[PDB]
Design a protein around this ligand. Sequence first.
Ligand SMILES: *[C@@H]1O[C@H](CO)[C@@H](O[C@@H]2O[C@H](CO)[C@@H](O)[C@H](O)[C@H]2NC(C)=O)[C@H](O)[C@H]1NC(C)=O
Ligand SMILES: *[C@@H]1O[C@H](CO)[C@@H](O[C@@H]2O[C@H](CO)[C@@H](O)[C@H](O)[C@H]2NC(C)=O)[C@H](O)[C@H]1NC(C)=O
Ligand SMILES: *[C@@H]1O[C@H](CO)[C@@H](O[C@@H]2O[C@H](CO)[C@@H](O)[C@H](O)[C@H]2NC(C)=O)[C@H](O)[C@H]1NC(C)=O
Ligand SMILES: *[C@@H]1O[C@H](CO)[C@@H](O[C@@H]2O[C@H](CO)[C@@H](O)[C@H](O)[C@H]2NC(C)=O)[C@H](O)[C@H]1NC(C)=O
Ligand SMILES: *[C@@H]1O[C@H](CO)[C@@H](O[C@@H]2O[C@H](CO)[C@@H](O)[C@H](O)[C@H]2NC(C)=O)[C@H](O)[C@H]1NC(C)=O
Ligand SMILES: *[C@@H]1O[C@H](CO)[C@@H](O)[C@H](O)[C@H]1NC(C)=O
Ligand SMILES: *[C@@H]1O[C@H](CO)[C@@H](O)[C@H](O)[C@H]1NC(C)=O
Ligand SMILES: *[C@@H]1O[C@H](CO)[C@@H](O)[C@H](O)[C@H]1NC(C)=O
Ligand SMILES: *[C@@H]1O[C@H](CO)[C@@H](O)[C@H](O)[C@H]1NC(C)=O
Ligand SMILES: *[C@@H]1O[C@H](CO)[C@@H](O)[C@H](O)[C@H]1NC(C)=O
Ligand SMILES: *[C@@H]1O[C@H](CO)[C@@H](O)[C@H](O)[C@H]1NC(C)=O
Ligand SMILES: *[C@@H]1O[C@H](CO)[C@@H](O)[C@H](O)[C@H]1NC(C)=O
Ligand SMILES: *[C@@H]1O[C@H](CO)[C@@H](O)[C@H](O)[C@H]1NC(C)=O
Ligand SMILES: *[C@@H]1O[C@H](CO)[C@@H](O)[C@H](O)[C@H]1NC(C)=O
Ligand SMILES: *[C@@H]1O[C@H](CO)[C@@H](O)[C@H](O)[C@H]1NC(C)=O
Ligand SMILES: *[C@@H]1O[C@H](CO)[C@@H](O)[C@H](O)[C@H]1NC(C)=O
Ligand SMILES: *[C@@H]1O[C@H](CO)[C@@H](O)[C@H](O)[C@H]1NC(C)=O
Ligand SMILES: *[C@@H]1O[C@H](CO)[C@@H](O)[C@H](O)[C@H]1NC(C)=O
Ligand SMILES: *[C@@H]1O[C@H](CO)[C@@H](O)[C@H](O)[C@H]1NC(C)=O
Lengths: 49, 445, 502, 138, 149, 49
Amino acid sequence: GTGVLTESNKKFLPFQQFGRDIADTTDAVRDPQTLEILDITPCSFGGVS
Amino acid sequence: AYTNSFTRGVYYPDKVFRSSVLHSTQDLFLPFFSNVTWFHNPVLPFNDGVYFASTEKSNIIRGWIFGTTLDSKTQSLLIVNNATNVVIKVCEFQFCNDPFLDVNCTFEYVSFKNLREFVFKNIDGYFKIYSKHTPINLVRDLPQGFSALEPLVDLPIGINITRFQTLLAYYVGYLQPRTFLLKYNENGTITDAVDCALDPLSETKCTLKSFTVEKGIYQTSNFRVQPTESIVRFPNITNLCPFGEVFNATRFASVYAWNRKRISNCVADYSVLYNSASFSTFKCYGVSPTKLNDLCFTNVYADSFVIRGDEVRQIAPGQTGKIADYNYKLPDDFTGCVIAWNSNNLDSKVGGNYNYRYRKPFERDISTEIYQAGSKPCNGVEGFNCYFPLQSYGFQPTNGVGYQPYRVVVLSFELLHAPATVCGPKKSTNLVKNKCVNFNFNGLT
Amino acid sequence: VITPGTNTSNQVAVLYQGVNCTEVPVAIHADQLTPTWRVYSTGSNVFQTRAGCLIGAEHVNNSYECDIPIGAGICASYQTQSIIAYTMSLGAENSVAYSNNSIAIPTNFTISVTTEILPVSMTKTSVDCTMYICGDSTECSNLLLQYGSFCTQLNRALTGIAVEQDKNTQEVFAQVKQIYKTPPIKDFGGFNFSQILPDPSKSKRSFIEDLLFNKVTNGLTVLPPLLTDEMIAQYTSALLAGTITSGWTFGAGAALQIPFAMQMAYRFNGIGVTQNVLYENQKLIANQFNSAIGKIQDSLSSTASALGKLQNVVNQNAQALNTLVKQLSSNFGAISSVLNDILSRLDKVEAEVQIDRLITGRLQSLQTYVTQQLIRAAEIRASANLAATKMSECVLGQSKRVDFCGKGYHLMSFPQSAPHGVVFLHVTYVPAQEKNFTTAPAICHDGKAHFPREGVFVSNGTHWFVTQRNFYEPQIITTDNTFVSGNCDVVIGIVNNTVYDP
Amino acid sequence: FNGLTVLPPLLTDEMIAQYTSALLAGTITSGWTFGAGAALQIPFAMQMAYRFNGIGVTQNVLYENQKLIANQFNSAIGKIQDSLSSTASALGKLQNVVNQNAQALNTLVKQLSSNFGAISSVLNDILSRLDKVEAEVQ
Amino acid sequence: SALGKLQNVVNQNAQALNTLVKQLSSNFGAISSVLNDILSRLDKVEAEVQIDRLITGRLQSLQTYVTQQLIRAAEIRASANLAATKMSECVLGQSKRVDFCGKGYHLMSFPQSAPHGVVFLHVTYVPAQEKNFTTAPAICHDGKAHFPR
Amino acid sequence: TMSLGAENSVAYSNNSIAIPTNFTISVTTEILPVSMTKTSVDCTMYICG
Ligand SMILES: *[C@@H]1O[C@H](CO)[C@@H](O[C@@H]2O[C@H](CO)[C@@H](O)[C@H](O)[C@H]2NC(C)=O)[C@H](O)[C@H]1NC(C)=O
Ligand SMILES: *[C@@H]1O[C@H](CO)[C@@H](O[C@@H]2O[C@H](CO)[C@@H](O)[C@H](O)[C@H]2NC(C)=O)[C@H](O)[C@H]1NC(C)=O
Ligand SMILES: *[C@@H]1O[C@H](CO)[C@@H](O[C@@H]2O[C@H](CO)[C@@H](O)[C@H](O)[C@H]2NC(C)=O)[C@H](O)[C@H]1NC(C)=O
Ligand SMILES: *[C@@H]1O[C@H](CO)[C@@H](O[C@@H]2O[C@H](CO)[C@@H](O)[C@H](O)[C@H]2NC(C)=O)[C@H](O)[C@H]1NC(C)=O
Ligand SMILES: *[C@@H]1O[C@H](CO)[C@@H](O[C@@H]2O[C@H](CO)[C@@H](O)[C@H](O)[C@H]2NC(C)=O)[C@H](O)[C@H]1NC(C)=O
Ligand SMILES: *[C@@H]1O[C@H](CO)[C@@H](O)[C@H](O)[C@H]1NC(C)=O
Ligand SMILES: *[C@@H]1O[C@H](CO)[C@@H](O)[C@H](O)[C@H]1NC(C)=O
Ligand SMILES: *[C@@H]1O[C@H](CO)[C@@H](O)[C@H](O)[C@H]1NC(C)=O
Ligand SMILES: *[C@@H]1O[C@H](CO)[C@@H](O)[C@H](O)[C@H]1NC(C)=O
Ligand SMILES: *[C@@H]1O[C@H](CO)[C@@H](O)[C@H](O)[C@H]1NC(C)=O
Ligand SMILES: *[C@@H]1O[C@H](CO)[C@@H](O)[C@H](O)[C@H]1NC(C)=O
Ligand SMILES: *[C@@H]1O[C@H](CO)[C@@H](O)[C@H](O)[C@H]1NC(C)=O
Ligand SMILES: *[C@@H]1O[C@H](CO)[C@@H](O)[C@H](O)[C@H]1NC(C)=O
Ligand SMILES: *[C@@H]1O[C@H](CO)[C@@H](O)[C@H](O)[C@H]1NC(C)=O
Ligand SMILES: *[C@@H]1O[C@H](CO)[C@@H](O)[C@H](O)[C@H]1NC(C)=O
Ligand SMILES: *[C@@H]1O[C@H](CO)[C@@H](O)[C@H](O)[C@H]1NC(C)=O
Ligand SMILES: *[C@@H]1O[C@H](CO)[C@@H](O)[C@H](O)[C@H]1NC(C)=O
Ligand SMILES: *[C@@H]1O[C@H](CO)[C@@H](O)[C@H](O)[C@H]1NC(C)=O
Ligand SMILES: *[C@@H]1O[C@H](CO)[C@@H](O)[C@H](O)[C@H]1NC(C)=O
């Protein structure tokens, strides 16, 4: 996807690879080369008036 | 011997973190309060997958074997905890089920007050293991309480497992496709679950996606009376249809004067046609050939002729060309089958067989009047742009494949509307009344 | 499935709607071919009803109020324990003590405060429908051009809904020309508004507005309302401070001050109770009001389920957006719901056929959402038009429309703001302690038939009096209390009595 | 009946008639008082005297004309029966609720007979005649 | 600027009809949005596939229009029911309902017709030039309390 | 930031009243929409031309 990757406080279990939101959108990931957890945000959008 | 499974045997269905949320999931699960068999060993079926558990703090129970035979003739899983490691291979092992103390190979891998629990399943060509270990206070039955199992292993091996056995107290139960509602806490663990089919309150919890429900009346489901039996009602004909008089007729007609045979008052078997290696093409339009033996028809008409192999493509709805535009046409909504074969082994003659000739839907016309292709009123005289309407196919045994003779048969189906007269080989049942049944009247299911 | 709440019991009863009980255990249920609906051939009892076959509930010949409604006059409840089923009762029976000369007159009253909650506005929303349908994929966005104006009139529709929510809010609260503010002193004749007036320690909401705000609890974008919650609270403060210091006069012109005990004496004349009844009972009336406002604080402290209308607007907006987002995961018959799978697995000529299924299903899913939002906004607008009318007729006036501004004869009402809506505290006079009296339509004196100018004739059994209709207060009958029309013979049920001439 | 169902009302017609009876018995025996508290009895000819003051006609006008006013009412309720007994088309508002719902369900059921471009409008024809790969498209 | 409610009724219906006409130019996935191109270029079995895309799109286009017109008609009915109530209460009577027939104490009102609507000229009494006074709830004379009638 | 109106402290006290000594007759205009433009669409001619 496209997004802003960020550091996070989320407590994944050792076998868990990525996290999902209430509506099943992916919103966190484990980095496979150093096993810390990143929090994912959409890149900003909105109407222009 | 049997034991109640309680709320045992739930596992993390996917490798996804979720928190403070209720997730509805469908998977192969051990149903709540099912009967789990108890043992103190036999070969057992694997079915859709297994939940396995034992009372263990000793390694008296070393491991498991799995496969079709679980022995010699083909690849089979051996899994052993040898106290140094988990040891795995999938070889064609011929060794007996007693390697333990008295107390090819296409893949390989290496890695009481207590109960040890496992799930084994085999999906998408991959073999999966999940596990848990816990303290307990009863050896003689499974602990009534909740604890989710987490994955260990996920092998690419593709083996069609159907049986397994234990290697030397233990419990075995079978997974089934069910919907569960799983409670994820703040820290990513499954902490409770609902088996939705267990009772109407569990249906209500799963309908609301909630572990508590308020006072009220909730629609959870729909009800139907189900069919008690299956009824088949067909005409009582035993006469077989004379298809040999079509497909093995001595002389086939010309494409300009195509011949029609009515088929009636008989039991057909289209497998006798469709199984045959005799046919170079076999295509059906408003029906699939695999379904024909289930159907019944008011009439069947066989239309047949010989034609040049390259032109056989014109014998379909929506086509155009000389044979389609002047000799024979199917309607563009045609319901039926077209069959043909290369007939150079019978139809050809060394001078080119002069008997075979070409010039609305299901028209036929044998009129001999000259083509007045020119502005001339040709008045029965041939010449430049004045020609007899028929031309002959040059069918000789030396012809190249597109120029060879092919024999053609088209079967046209009159559907059930009036009472039917040509049926597939379906055996009629006795008739049952006032009960709910499945039924089939002449193909009307 | 009928449930007492899992808070209370795990027992249930099951209703098979329109089915006959002779079929039920011979079906998908119990002792026949049974897809998933596992066995309970009886749950404890089986009982045929006009609504369907009812399983696991106990039939009862009593008739309670309807706890859980089953249909066709049947209800169910949890009692001495088991689930019971019964024919519901409509209310207590009452043969009124009517006769051609008996009247009942109330000798005392209660001031009553009742709370009415009204929705006023939805959450505002807008969707970048190209970014919803196609997720910023270029191959999809080129196919979406073939559909023309659809993903443009969707935004024109949602823009009309969004602009209307700010109109709905302005029609209700902006009914005041000037921001009126309360005096420093609070000498309102012993009435105590401190729990509904603004709190300088607080936004600067009242104590009750703080309860109300506590109890209610992509390509898609959510827009801010035009008036902030602090502006909404300055309008409810101005409406309330005008109402307390000036009566209805701030609605008809410039606010004219009046003492609050004299404003309430006018509210008493408005319901047809003689104004001395307030000045003679002022401390009692003030205590009944102060006590009644105290019960509102307790009622709003006890449960959130009082505000179920406002919590429904919150819940419906969330449910609709969750469904609109979940529908991105659906196939609609396509090879995958992930748009980048289709573009990477297939050549263009196959990919365009598979992508147009996702475009078709997502475009249909978004048109379904916008249609449902247009229908829901029309319901919220009808509620905002009612709240705007209750502001003018109940808050800025004194309504004489029965049951419009709560039950009993209306005195006044006060607005408090709440999330997505408004709350009216309707204050009303309820008569409370009636006595029976004998009555006559007229009295005959020197042949002249006398009728009361205002009020009714009554007798205690030995003496005749004239009294006002809504509060028992007897006066001796005199030529200033009555008027004459004709002689005794025309009037049915006239009685002979003295009329005094002062 | 193809998955269509009609649910019963909660209040049956005899329960609706018990409510209109209670409203009407309260109105006749107690005037407006049962809407603002507990019902207070008052004689009906004396309730009508208050209804006359409410329209700005002085209440002596009722008592001086009570038998005339009672006859004009009793005769007016006679004309209601004759009107409803003659002219069922007076209830056109209620009858259109029935007709609109019947037209809506008949259109919903008739649409099952439509092909929408499939081989047949009948789902069991497709499943009898075509094998799975071909049937799914229909 | 005052009659913007009635001018919006005209504009809403004009945009709806122009949107409905403009959608005839859309392909919806056909080779052309002009039906005679399909019928002249493609023979019948090929042509039906393309025409069914235009049928599906043009039918969805028209269902979208009629559904938005049904919702817009219900909105105008609520306004016509209010205008009918304003005529009975304000024009045929004198309404005591606060702010129903304009601001101030309502005296009377007059109807004037306007295209697609109605206009009420509401006549109201507005009080003016207030003065402050001392006031009392009651008066004592011979030991007894007097109140104003 | 928008202004909600002029701020005003009403001169309230337990014995003061204000009474209007004059009036103005006011005429106010209220506009209401009552009907749409009546339409018919022949869907065979719109869809198939
Ligand atoms: C009836 O006679 C007409 C000629 O009068 C036949 O017309 C031909 O039909 C085929 C159909 O594929 C066309 O390709 C030819 O071009 C037609 N010929 C002419 C000169 O137009 C017709 O086939 C006959 N119908 C029947 C039922 O026999
Ligand atoms: C009218 O009703 C009120 C209650 O609503 C009565 O007031 C109570 O009177 C008793 C003594 O009789 C006191 O113990 C209570 O504390 C009073 N309550 C309040 C709120 O003051 C009142 O007495 C009744 N009046 C008549 C004439 O019956
Ligand atoms: C108006 O009523 C409120 C209560 O609703 C009074 O406030 C309470 O006053 C007592 C005694 O001073 C305190 O013990 C409480 O803590 C107060 N409660 C709150 C929430 O503030 C208030 O004093 C009354 N006002 C007047 C002028 O008497
Ligand atoms: C009806 O009302 C009258 C006036 O209030 C009552 O007459 C008074 O009765 C008391 C004793 O109860 C005497 O002390 C007074 O002197 C009487 N006054 C007059 C003017 O007669 C009468 O008792 C009441 N009747 C009933 C049955 O209660
Ligand atoms: C009211 O008082 C009058 C007298 O002032 C009563 O009239 C008498 O009625 C009786 C019975 O009908 C007659 O025999 C007398 O001749 C009447 N007397 C006079 C002087 O006319 C009248 O009946 C009383 N009304 C009621 C309701 O008791
Ligand atoms: C990956 O390799 C680097 C060294 O190349 C090492 O520092 C890092 O810890 C490794 N991470 C994992 C998850 O193995
Ligand atoms: C099967 O399981 C149920 C509990 O769900 C138990 O009551 C029953 O006795 C078991 N039957 C056998 C044959 O073990
Ligand atoms: C366990 O297995 C490994 C090979 O998988 C072997 O080297 C080791 O010696 C074994 N240990 C024991 C105790 O048998
Ligand atoms: C090994 O595999 C081949 C087929 O790949 C099979 O013919 C042979 O019998 C197998 N041998 C053993 C010992 O399993
Ligand atoms: C599993 O069985 C299928 C036939 O159903 C066969 O095609 C496949 O090769 C088998 N795979 C293994 C590894 O046994
Ligand atoms: C969640 O994890 C934290 C440490 O990250 C721990 O302190 C806390 O007790 C855990 N809570 C639960 C409910 O497991
Ligand atoms: C045609 O004859 C051959 C034997 O010559 C036979 O096998 C075949 O079944 C016959 N065809 C049909 C349709 O029975
Ligand atoms: C059950 O619900 C009621 C309110 O419906 C509540 O008063 C009661 O405390 C609840 N019971 C429990 C065990 O919380
Ligand atoms: C229920 O079904 C039976 C036949 O099984 C029938 O006799 C009975 O009258 C039916 N009762 C109702 C209320 O439908
Ligand atoms: C309840 O009512 C039925 C008749 O409706 C009667 O047969 C039965 O005896 C009654 N039972 C009780 C306990 O009243
Ligand atoms: C009035 O009196 C009758 C008896 O004469 C009694 O039945 C009724 O309950 C009384 N009503 C009131 C309101 O006191
Ligand atoms: C009042 O009612 C009673 C009983 O219905 C009757 O005897 C009496 O004549 C009536 N009196 C009047 C004045 O109507
Ligand atoms: C009334 O008196 C107060 C001071 O007591 C003053 O502020 C206010 O402006 C006066 N109003 C009028 C209308 O004179
Ligand atoms: C009342 O107002 C009018 C203007 O509306 C003015 O001409 C007139 O003099 C005023 N009268 C008094 C007594 O103030």
